[PDB]
Design an enzyme around this catalytic site. Structure first.
Site, PDB file in Angstrom:
ATOM      1  N   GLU A   1       0.825  -1.203   0.000  1.00  0.00           N
ATOM      2  CA  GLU A   1       0.000   0.000   0.000  1.00  0.00           C
ATOM      3  C   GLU A   1       0.862   1.256   0.000  1.00  0.00           C
ATOM      4  OE1 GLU A   1      -1.047   2.374   2.785  1.00  0.00           O
ATOM      5  OE2 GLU A   1      -2.038   3.391   1.112  1.00  0.00           O
ATOM      6  N   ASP A   2       1.968   1.239   0.740  1.00  0.00           N
ATOM      7  CA  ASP A   2       2.920   2.347   0.781  1.00  0.00           C
ATOM      8  C   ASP A   2       4.205   1.885   0.099  1.00  0.00           C
ATOM      9  OD1 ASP A   2       1.094   3.931   2.078  1.00  0.00           O
ATOM     10  OD2 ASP A   2       2.424   4.448   3.747  1.00  0.00           O
ATOM     11  N   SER A   3       4.245   2.036  -1.222  1.00  0.00           N
ATOM     12  CA  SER A   3       5.393   1.624  -2.022  1.00  0.00           C
ATOM     13  C   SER A   3       5.095   1.947  -3.480  1.00  0.00           C
ATOM     14  CB  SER A   3       5.703   0.135  -1.853  1.00  0.00           C
ATOM     15  OG  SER A   3       6.943  -0.197  -2.453  1.00  0.00           O
TER      16      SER A   3
END
Ligand SMILES: [Zn+2]
Ligand SMILES: [Zn+2]
Ligand SMILES: [Zn+2]
Lengths: 46, 115, 202, 170, 45, 257, 44, 50, 59, 58, 124, 48, 235, 65
Positions: free
Chosen positions: M204-206
């Protein structure tokens, strides 16, 4: 031996227990190990 | 600083064997080919050809890590056949396969140039 | 419990590795086509929104003429706020539920919610059907000005648009009035989130 | 006898001095300033953020061959996780991608007015279809590693992106 | 005469362009200091 | 138990790109060859840059780097030249590199921009593609840009500048005969150029048995290596690498025995 | 070392423990032309 | 169901009857409990101090 | 803040909520209706000091 | 030329005076506080033109 | 190595690039190395991640993978089984032997399940 | 009825503070009146 | 009101507030009053006519500016207190005619609602389509974005200054972006982004980048750190 | 600051096209029409020219050392 903080990135190939670390950070960090005849050569080369 | 050299992807490391054949004890007639300094461009070349061979029971490749730049190929064949022969024979077919393609391309390239 | 922790870890690793390789063949994506629903559902969503808006006006008219009767456990002003809230709240759920059925199996929005990995049915509702009411401090948008939420709305206006009801989905686009009301609702969440972490950590 | 009190580099970064300035401060004493210039190449640790949504670190860098190429041979410059779009991202990213594809294809800068009724998702989709592209922007991407077509048709568009000051090298 | 709705979209942005061309983005900073340095400083003395 | 015969035909041949169709070939071979064009193909590009005097607005790092991205017309010189690592040199030589120079000075009031034409190369054949024109930088009056550069053979995977392919459009099964990709609404999707289908037919009927074949290739070159020669080098370059694996493979068997 | 005035852009030699000022201008800011030791640049 | 009283039926299967509950603001458990027609067992407050 | 031109413009037009008894009693963090057309509603630093610092509206 | 200015350079550092919102002067405001001993507050801070004397509030 | 009072130990692997790699299943962190052997042995015995305990990018694909519609050809099955560490080495018999072999997603996932565990669950 | 929950109540549970925010009390009726509605009103009045 | 529109002794800056319910007329002239321009509407008709726009279209070389509009009385300024008793219309289409008259007496009309956004929010396309926290989040990210802050960066010396190799104006731009001059000095580079889960290397955070693109200058930027030192005779 | 040499996506040269792109704009040609003349069929390359800013023009205003 506290290390320098760095950002985190995912790596599916690595196992959940395993963690990736760069060469530079690992170079600064040191692990004291007691030398033994079974690994005397290993410490001698390092 | 920490960026790996760009040429390490294909350059062969000093004192490192390019190819290592390791037998697998889980199933008889199985071997692992841990090629180094190669990418999926080479893994899929041999896997598909190995499947075409009827005497191959299980053939495949995988990469433990993209940054490692080493590919692992596992080949299993019938008791009469050997995984080592499968890897060697498959490569020869690819060389022959590309020779016809390269030769035929040179035949057709001139045909289009002239008309 | 059956095997232990060491075997369980391999189960996690095998699932992640094997599925990732297969994902290169199947593939997961997301696009506008997921948000774009069939025209049949759009008419139903607007029809439900229109019906809710008319119902709110009818409730407002009843209170205007004193026809509305307060419940014994509440006052007239609070009772009116409760009746209007249910009409707007019900419309979002009903329209949102229809949106969930609208998505096909091939649709990527349905795949995420069906598996339960990421997102929620409410998120799809705000993207396709309707964002919903923007409550501030547990109530509708307050009358910052003299009996009017914003200067554009007439004085003493208790309609859906005036009080912050957002009838437009994210895909369709919010009206200028709705954007500010949406910001007011989002601001409360950010303030609550900022203090929630500080208190919870304590 | 004198004691050294010179100033060394604040960090270990490799840089080339750009310009050197020698002046006199308000007190009249000699005063100098020098600007050290260094070049930072984006890597796996740099944090990239779209115009809206949460910043995303560069999980991994892939060569053009490994990237999923389309029918026309356009390997995407950046690949983001689809699971971000639902909650910590907005549909505007998909709309901006659709507008960017139309803007680039038609050679006209799209209008980004928040409350302009002229611009609509359906209108943008219709314009894209005129240039031999999917109305919703979805495209068939061929996986770089294995050439077989991916079952799901990826959504690809020219989305504006910005590089945040947060960098791993620092 | 009158601004037709089909032309209001371009017309509305034209007047805004003149506003920024004359006033600018930091007019509020400069104006207050100008008042302070022109009258307030004199008034204090 | 052997490979097939990859029959190949050419559709159209032009300076910018060449289109050819390869039949009776495995998907892996066709897909691998596509990436062989991008990475395996070696071309000559500027890698070593040294500036003797830089007064331009742009910085030393930016100006020096920009030269590398400029392609060089290395048609046959790249083949005869060798990598610096394998050469017997500690410093660049004509046999393992080429000499590049760019000495310009702006003295006119009007803005003057140095382009690739002013980039002088010792080797007459190894020259910039444009030599409209690849502009390097814009120089003001009184600004000079004197520097020396060298170019060396390198793989495409090593750096993007060594990639002669300006986008490879590789396609197979345009009509989706084998359903390798499933469209929720096939009618909406447009028809590909190579597909042979009627207007009223969304996609060809699915065949229970079949394999990917008749791969369509459109190799677009940046001008460094002609698109009609990149394929010849790529096919030879891919197989010469394959043979090298066999040579090392034989040694491993010799060790096991 | 040799410096450059920031106004007239002319060479002016300034020694150690010497006032920083341009003779032709009196300008109080000076720059350094460049170093004769060249560096190696790689197009990456 | 939690608020509703659960009483074992004659047959044996659990059944939850409908009983009116009066939730009141403030704490007066000492006096509220000592009231006619008020359950002294199930009447509990949410204030630990009281 | 000279990191970006947009940041520089925002900083110049930056606003600060009142401090002390006036700010403490009121709810400066919460977005009010009066900000329409005068103070940008979306723009606000994230953290504990959320809503205290704002930016002037363009017009 | 594109730099709008509007800041002060002090010791080589560019500083921007952040606007500080304050309660309007010469205005009558009535607020209700439940903590005070009195029901209502007739707060009205009164000051002359630009500033002749320190602000006084009753 | 041990890092984030409950801390989970990890096995360090050296990688070329700078940023840390974690198999999540962003925020900066500092990893601590136990110098003493005694605590190092203790950490690896009780503080390891397996004893402490999936990403959203895998759960969504898992639901699609186990769908009855999914059918895997021999070539595709080979790649999936290669990454399977807990593989006996024998390819399972295809569900649909004729006209062509086609392994279902569950059959591949069956080998993923370790040992013999029985459970009944329901889809959303 | 508005019953404070979440962090505000969790704090007040660990914080033994004598005066909570909304210290509600639940009254359970017994007997015949527990079923009838009107018969429960007199109890409501005598408690309020 | 007539004097205010005519730039008479009463300046347009001054605001008059009519508290009808309290029979109070409040006139404020002190500084610190935040106000915004608004088109004046008379008898459900805009005072801004075609001729006014025609002169504005030729604003250059014609000795015509914004100040002339206030002089003619087409546009005046309304503060928060006066906005209390001033009716507004979103667009002329709302006030020109309606099937059911929501309000038959419109006093002022907003030029364009998008002006509510600030400098950082104005650069966001379709913010209405975007969630409120995301718009707030971008405001922080936008400031942290690296790019060309000014043109005279070489001459000045700054402790921290990040300049992008190829700051490219976006393909999708807002009309208000022109006034911010962000087009001239952008702080980002466009990217052909394909939203897919490739190799599972992006959570999700990448995000996953293209190595070849970076080698061509996809997002490279320079970094400047200024070191200062003075030799002073303190003792 | 200046137009990139080649497209970051595929690698097609775009710097040389910038000089012709500006020349076509002043020749009454449409913004999208100019791109077709230069031969930018892909939308990735059209991005490099349609929405590019040449900052070096303003930097060159300042006099050098
Ligand atoms: Zn040599
Ligand atoms: Zn001078
Ligand atoms: Zn391109």
């Amino acid at each position: 031996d506290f290390s320098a903080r760095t950002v985190i990135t995912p790596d599916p190939n690595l196992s959940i227990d395993q963690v990736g670390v760069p060469r530079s950070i690992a170079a600064n960090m040191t692990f004291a190990e007691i030398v033994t005849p079974f690994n005397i050569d290993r410490l001698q080369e390092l | 600083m920490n960026a790996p050299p760009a040429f390490e992807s294909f350059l062969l490391f000093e004192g490192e064997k390019k190819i290592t054949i390791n037998k697998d004890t889980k199933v008889p007639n199985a071997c692992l080919f841990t090629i180094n300094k190669e990418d999926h461009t080479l893994g899929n070349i041999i896997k598909s050809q190995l499947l075409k061979d009827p005497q191959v029971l299980f053939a495949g490749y995988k990469v433990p890590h993209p940054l490692e730049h080493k590919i692992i190929i596992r080949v299993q064949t019938t008791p009469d056949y050997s995984p080592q022969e499968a890897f060697t024979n498959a490569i020869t077919d690819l060389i022959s396969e590309l020779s016809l393609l390269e030769e035929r391309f040179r035949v057709a390239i001139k045909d289009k140039q002239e008309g | 419990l059956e095997m232990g922790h060491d075997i369980t870890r391999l189960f996690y690793s095998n699932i992640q590795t094997v599925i990732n390789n297969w994902l290169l063949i199947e593939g997961h994506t997301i696009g506008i086509g997921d948000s774009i629903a069939d025209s049949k559902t759009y008419q139903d969503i607007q029809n439900t929104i229109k019906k809710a808006k008319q119902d709110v006006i009818e409730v407002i008219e009843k209170a205007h003429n004193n026809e509305l009767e307060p419940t014994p456990g509440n006052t007239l002003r609070q009772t009116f706020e409760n009746q209007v809230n249910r009409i707007l709240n019900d419309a979002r759920d009903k329209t949102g539920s229809s949106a969930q059925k609208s998505l096909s199996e091939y649709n990527n929005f349905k795949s995420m919610v069906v598996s339960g990995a990421k997102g929620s049915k409410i998120n799809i509702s705000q993207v396709i059907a309707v964002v919903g009411q923007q409550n501030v401090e547990g109530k509708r948008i307050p009358f910052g000005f003299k009996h009017r939420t914003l200067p554009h709305f007439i004085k003493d206006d208790y309609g859906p648009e005036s009080r912050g009801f957002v009838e437009n989905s994210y895909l369709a686009g919010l009206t200028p009035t709705e954007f500010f009301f949406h910001a007011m609702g989002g601001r409360e969440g950010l303030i609550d989130t900022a203090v929630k972490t500080a208190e919870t950590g304590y | 006898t004198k004691r050294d009190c010179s100033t060394f580099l604040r960090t270990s970064e490799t840089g080339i001095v750009d310009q050197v300035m020698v002046t006199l401060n308000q007190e009249g004493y000699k005063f100098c300033k020098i600007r050290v210039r260094s070049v930072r190449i984006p890597q796996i640790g740099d944090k990239f953020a779209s115009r809206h949504g949460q910043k995303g670190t560069c999980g991994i860098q892939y060569r053009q061959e490994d990237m999923p190429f389309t029918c026309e041979g356009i390997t995407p410059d950046i690949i983001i996780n689809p699971h971000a779009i639902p909650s910590r991202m907005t549909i505007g990213h998909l709309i901006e991608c659709l507008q960017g594809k139309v803007s680039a294809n038609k050679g006209e800068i799209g209008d980004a007015t928040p409350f302009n009724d002229a611009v609509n998702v359906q209108k943008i989709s219709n314009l894209l279809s005129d240039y031999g592209y999917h109305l919703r922007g979805n495209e068939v991407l061929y996986n770089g590693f294995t050439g077989r077509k991916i079952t799901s048709q990826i959504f690809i568009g020219p989305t504006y992106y910005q590089r945040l000051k947060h960098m791993v090298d620092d | 005469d009158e601004i037709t709705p089909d032309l209001w979209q371009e017309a509305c942005w034209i007047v805004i362009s003149s506003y920024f061309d004359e006033k600018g983005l930091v007019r509020q900073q400069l104006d207050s200091f100008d008042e302070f340095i022109q009258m307030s400083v004199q008034r204090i003395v | 138990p052997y490979a097939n015969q990859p029959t190949v035909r050419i559709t159209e041949l032009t300076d910018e790109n060449v289109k050819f169709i390869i039949e009776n070939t495995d998907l892996a071979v066709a897909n691998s060859i596509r990436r062989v064009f991008i990475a395996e193909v070696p071309i000559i590009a500027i890698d070593w840059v040294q500036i003797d005097a830089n007064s331009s607005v742009l910085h030393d790092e930016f100006i020096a780097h920009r030269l590398g991205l400029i392609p060089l017309t290395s048609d046959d010189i790249v083949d005869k030249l060798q990598y610096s690592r394998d050469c017997t040199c500690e410093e660049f030589c004509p046999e393992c590199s080429v000499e590049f120079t760019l000495d310009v000075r702006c003295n006119e009031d009007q803005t003057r921009h140095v382009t690739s034409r002013d980039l002088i190369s010792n080797s007459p054949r190894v020259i910039p593609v444009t030599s409209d024109d690849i502009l390097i930088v814009k120089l003001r009056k009184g600004q000079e840009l004197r520097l020396r550069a060298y170019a060396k053979k390198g793989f495409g995977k090593e750096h993007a500048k060594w990639n002669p392919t300006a986008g490879v459009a590789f396609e197979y099964d345009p009509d989706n005969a084998l359903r390798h990709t499933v469209y929720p609404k096939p009618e909406e999707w447009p028809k590909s150029e190579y597909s042979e289908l009627d207007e009223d037919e969304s996609q060809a009927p699915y065949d229970p048995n079949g394999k990917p074949e008749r791969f369509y290739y459109n190799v677009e070159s940046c001008g460094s290596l002609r698109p009609e020669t990149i394929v010849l080098s790529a096919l030879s370059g891919l197989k010469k690498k394959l043979s090298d694996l066999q040579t090392q493979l034989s040694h491993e068997i010799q060790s096991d025995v | 070392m040799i410096y450059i005035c920031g106004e007239c852009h002319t060479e002016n030699e300034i020694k150690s423990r010497d006032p920083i000022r341009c003779r032709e201008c009196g300008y109080r800011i000076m720059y350094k032309k460049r170093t004769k030791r060249l560096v190696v640049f790689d197009a990456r | 169901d939690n608020k509703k009283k659960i009483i074992i039926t004659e047959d044996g299967e659990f059944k939850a009857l409908q009983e009116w509950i009066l939730e009141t603001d403030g704490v007066s458990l000492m006096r509220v409990l000592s009231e006619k027609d008020v359950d002294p067992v199930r009447t509990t407050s949410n204030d630990i101090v009281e | 803040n000279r990191l970006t031109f947009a940041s520089t413009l925002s900083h110049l037009r930056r606003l600060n909520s009142p401090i002390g008894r006036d700010g403490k009693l009121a709810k400066p963090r919460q977005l009010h209706n009066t900000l329409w057309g005068m103070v940008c509603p979306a723009e606000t630093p994230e953290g504990h000091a959320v809503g205290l610092v704002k930016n002037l509206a363009l017009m | 030329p594109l730099d709008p200015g509007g800041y002060f350079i002090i010791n080589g550092s560019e500083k921007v005076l952040i606007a500080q919102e304050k309660m309007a002067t010469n205005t009558v405001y009535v607020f209700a506080k439940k903590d005070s001993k009195y029901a209502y507050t007739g707060e009205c801070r009164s000051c002359l033109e630009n500033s002749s004397r320190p602000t006084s509030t009753i | 190595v041990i890092f984030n009072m409950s801390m989970m130990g990890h096995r360090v692997r050296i990688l070329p690039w700078s940023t840390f790699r974690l198999n999540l299943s962003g925020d900066e962190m500092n990893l601590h190395l136990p110098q003493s052997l005694e605590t190092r042995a203790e950490i690896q015995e009780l503080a390891m991640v397996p004893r402490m305990i999936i990403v959203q990018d895998t759960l969504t694909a898992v639901r699609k993978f186990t769908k009855r519609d999914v059918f895997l050809e021999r070539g595709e099955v080979m790649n999936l089984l290669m990454f399977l560490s807990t593989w006996d080495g024998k390819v399972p018999q295809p569900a649909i032997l004729k006209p062509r072999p086609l392994w279902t997603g569950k059959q591949i996932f069956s080998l993923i399940i370790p040992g013999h565990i029985n459970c009944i669950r329901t889809h959303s | 009825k508005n019953v404070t929950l979440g962090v505000p109540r969790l704090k007040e549970l660990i914080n033994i503070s004598k005066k909570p925010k909304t210290p509600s009390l639940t009254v359970f009726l017994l007997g015949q009146s527990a079923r009838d509605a009107e018969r429960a009103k007199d109890i409501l009045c005598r408690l309020e | 009101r007539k004097l205010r529109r005519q730039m008479d002794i009463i300046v347009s800056e001054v605001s008059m507030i009519r508290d009808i319910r309290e029979r109070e007329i409040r006139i404020y002239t002190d500084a610190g009053r935040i106000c915004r321009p608004l088109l004046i509407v008379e008898k459900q008709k805009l005072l801004l006519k075609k001729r006014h726009i025609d002169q504005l279209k030729e604003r250059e070389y014609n000795n015509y500016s914004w100040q002339d509009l206030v002089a003619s009385g087409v546009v005046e300024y309304i503060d928060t207190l006066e906005e209390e008793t001033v009716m507004l219309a979103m667009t002329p289409d709302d006030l020109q005619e309606k099937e059911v008259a929501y309000c038959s007496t419109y006093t002022h009309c907003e030029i364009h609602p998008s002006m509510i956004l600030g400098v950082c929010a104005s650069i966001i396309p379709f913010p209405d389509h975007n969630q409120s926290p995301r718009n707030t989040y971008q405001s922080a990210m936008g400031k942290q974005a690296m790019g060309v802050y000014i043109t005279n960066f070489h001459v000045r010396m700054d402790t921290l200054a990040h300049v992008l190799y190829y700051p490219q104006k976006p393909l999708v731009t807002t009309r208000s972006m022109e006034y911010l001059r962000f087009r001239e000095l952008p702080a980002g580079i466009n990217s052909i982004v394909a939203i897919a889960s490739y190799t599972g290397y992006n959570q999700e955070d990448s995000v996953i980048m293209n190595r070849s693109a970076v080698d061509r200058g996809f997002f490279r930027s320079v970094f400047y750190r200024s070191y200062k030192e003075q030799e002073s005779k303190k003792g | 600051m200046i137009i990139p040499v080649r497209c970051f996506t595929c690698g097609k040269i775009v710097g040389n096209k910038w000089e012709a792109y500006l020349g076509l704009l002043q020749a009454e040609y449409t913004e999208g029409d100019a791109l077709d003349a230069l031969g930018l069929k892909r939308y990735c390359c059209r991005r490099m020219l349609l929405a590019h800013v040449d900052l070096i023009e303003k930097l060159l205003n300042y006099a050098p050392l």
